Design a protein around this ligand. Structure first.
Ligand SMILES: Nc1ncnc2c1ncn2[C@@H]1O[C@H](COP(=O)(O)OP(=O)(O)O)[C@@H](O)[C@H]1O
Ligand SMILES: CC(=O)/N=C1/NN(C(C)=O)[C@](C)(c2ccccc2)S1
Ligand SMILES: [Mg+2]
Length: 333
């Protein structure tokens, strides 16, 4: 098989956009997204697509999590490598979804903030779930940013802020690679996560001021690895290793080698062309497994309601729809 998952999430209007009206309507039950392509004179022309899941503007973070992220976490705990990423135009919610936002004036703890996104939630759930099944386990996390074909580690303490790091192909996995010098931190309890993110958050900032049009132009890849012990009825011991990669892509509005290449790889997979160009960009190289690989991958494509962004929105959905045909064969480690 076995197919990958694509879901669409559309954000609500800004204060700013309030005074417009939407051309996008998502009907979750039917799993469709409809966009009005006509402008002011047609109103009846629509483009509609069907995705595995569709989340409208009414959707809270919690819902997104339960709907797509939870199931994935189950798999990760079983030993699968899972990748989830966000794709969309800038300003449409990728960053929000994957990481979320922290509400102001400590109203909520990090754990209960409802603006929190997938990453922090995921980190939280992991400790809960794992802890609740007894068993020895450990968590390692890493975060890297890819800007302009250069990789920067956001968790490194080093004052060698932008030391480019190097990757090599990994022999153990033919579709994978290792990044030498990438810091991986072992997180021992839920109480250490926030500190990491925050730290990570800061370092990203520095780099922002280290280079041109950052946020919107680079990709961030967050990864968690989990090793859990299990015992069979026969005393044989099992070790499961699972990895979840959560990535926040660069705006689809777009030096952009990683993104282009990605589109290219996708086309190749979908069309069956004999040689697929994973090697052409740093990003595709690390996500090779995800696309046509051994991992289960989910893509969240985020779009916006505003009339203004119609062309981008349409393209975002086109892209998403066609990615639905990638096939992966998920396997357990
Ligand atoms: N589903 C949503 N619900 C509420 N606010 C959202 C949603 N999606 C995006 N936003 C808001 O819109 C702004 C842009 O989102 P951002 O996360 O930066 O998207 P991108 O990474 O695609 O630029 C942020 O202020 C964020 O709070
Ligand atoms: C790599 C990464 O995701 N870094 C983060 N730093 N955060 C801080 C400081 O609030 C985020 C936005 C968050 C949001 C809600 C709840 C908890 C954390 S996520
Ligand atoms: Mg962004």
């Amino acid at each position: 098989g076995k197919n990958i998952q694509v879901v669409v999430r559309c954000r609500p209007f800004n204060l700013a956009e309030r005074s417009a009206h939407s051309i996008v309507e998502c009907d979750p039950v039917r799993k469709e997204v409809s966009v009005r392509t006509g402008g002011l004179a047609d109103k009846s022309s629509r483009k509609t697509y069907t995705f595995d899941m569709v989340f409208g503007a009414s959707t809270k973070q919690i819902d997104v999590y339960r709907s797509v992220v939870c199931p994935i976490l189950d798999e990760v705990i079983m030993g699968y490598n899972c990748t989830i990423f966000a794709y969309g135009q800038t300003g449409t919610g990728k960053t929000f979804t994957m990481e979320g936002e922290r509400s102001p004036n400590e109203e909520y703890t990090w754990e209960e903030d409802p603006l929190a996104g997938i990453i922090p939630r995921t980190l939280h759930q992991i400790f809960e779930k794992l802890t609740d099944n007894g068993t020895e386990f450990s968590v390692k996390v890493s975060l890297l940013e890819i800007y302009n074909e250069e990789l920067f580690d956001l968790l490194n303490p080093s004052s060698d802020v932008s030391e480019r790091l190097q990757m090599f192909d990994d022999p153990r996995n033919k579709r994978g690679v290792i990044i030498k010098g990438l810091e991986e931190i072992t997180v021992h309890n839920k109480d250490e996560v926030y500190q990491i993110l925050e730290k990570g958050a800061a370092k990203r900032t520095t780099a922002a001021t280290l280079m041109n049009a950052y946020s919107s132009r680079s990709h961030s890849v967050f990864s968690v690895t989990i090793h859990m012990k299990e015992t069979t009825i026969d005393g044989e011991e099992l070790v499961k290793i699972g990895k979840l990669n959560l990535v926040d892509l660069a705006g689809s509005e777009n030096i952009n080698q990683s993104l282009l290449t990605l589109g290219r790889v996708i086309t190749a997979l979908v069309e069956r062309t004999p040689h697929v160009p994973y090697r052409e960009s740093k990003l595709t190289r690390i996500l090779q497994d995800s696309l046509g690989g051994r991992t289960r991958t989910s893509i969240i494509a985020t779009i916006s309601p505003a009339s203004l962004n119609l062309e981008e929105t349409l393209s975002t959905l086109e892209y998403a729809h066609r990615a639905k045909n990638i096939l992966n064969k998920p396997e357990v480690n």
